[PDB]
């Protein structure tokens, strides 16, 4: 809940970085899911798979919050996870980058 | 909601037939699930897979109702689906078999 003004260039650059990170992570999840599915030998084993999928959807939902008021926190958190690099967001304002860096400290 | 008395031999035979049918159907579902999972190419496609799994769990839950008051209906319904044959339940009472046959008519 950072109420700053975003330029068109800022929303464009943010969209590119958000998408790149989300795409990479979802690819990872899809590969893991498929692996787990293939490894199933007994019907009851579908249960733990559903537990995984639920946890992953919730995780993604919370982490990839595409609301501008939240994007500085999101980016910081992705930088902390090493899914985004600060260089990718250099076009954003210095104010924004400061907030992102602080968010990468939580 | 058929309130009849069941002998030990009757519950034993019923258990054998119930298990045989459930085992076959769950094997089918597991194979289909695995096929669908393997065929997924995009993350969003996990959604329709979850819709399938939910429908299948509900279906099984309702159909394989292991309560003695309901087993004559269950068996009749499985006979109608061709997952059980009446010969498998010949050891049950004639009264029970009559109820099963009527249930196979719905």
Residue numbers in the entry:
A (entry chain A), B (entry chain A): 1 to 106
Quote the study's own text:
However, the most common paralogue OCP1 relies on an allosteric regulation for photo-recovery: OCP1 interacts with the fluorescence recovery protein (FRP), a small, dimeric regulator that terminates the interaction with the phycobilisome, and strongly accelerates the back-conversion of OCPR into the resting orange state. We show that this interaction between the orange carotenoid protein (OCP) and its unrelated regulator, the fluorescence recovery protein (FRP), evolved when a precursor of FRP was horizontally acquired by cyanobacteria. Homologues of FRP (termed FRP-like, FRPL) can also be found in distantly related bacteria, mainly proteobacteria and acidobacteria, suggesting an origin far beyond cyanobacteria.
To understand the ancestral state of FRPL proteins before they were transferred into cyanobacteria, we heterologously expressed, purified and characterized the FRPL from one of the few isolated, mesophilic bacteria that feature FRPL (PbFRPL): the gamma-proteobacterium Pseudomonas borbori, a close relative of P. aeruginosa. Circular dichroism spectroscopy of PbFRPL showed the typical all alpha-helical fold, previously found in FRP in solution, and native mass spectrometry confirmed the distinctive dimeric state. We solved PbFRPL’s crystal structure to a resolution of 1.8 Å. The N-terminal domain consists of two antiparallel alpha-helices of about 50 Å in length and features a homo-dimerization interface similar to those in FRPs with an estimated buried surface of around 675 Å2. In P. borbori, the frpl gene is encoded on its single chromosome, and we did not find any OCP, HCP or CTDH homologues. Epi-fluorescence microscopy of PbFRPL fused to an mVenus fluorophore and expressed from a plasmid under its native promotor in P. borbori showed a homogeneous distribution across the whole cell during exponential growth and an additional concentration at the cell poles upon starvation with increased whole-cell integrated fluorescence by about 2.5- to 3.4-fold above wild-type increase. Our data indicate that despite their extremely similar structures, FRPLs carry out a potentially stress-related function that must be totally unrelated to OCPs and the regulation of photoprotection. FRPL from P. borbori, Methylocaldum sp. and Chlorobi sp. had virtually no effect on OCP1’s photo-recovery. In our AlphaFold2 model, phenylalanine 76, lysine 102 and leucine 106 in FRP of Synechocystis sp. PCC 6803 are in contact with OCP1. P. borbori FRPL for instance has the phenylalanine, but features a tyrosine at position 102 and a serine at position 106.
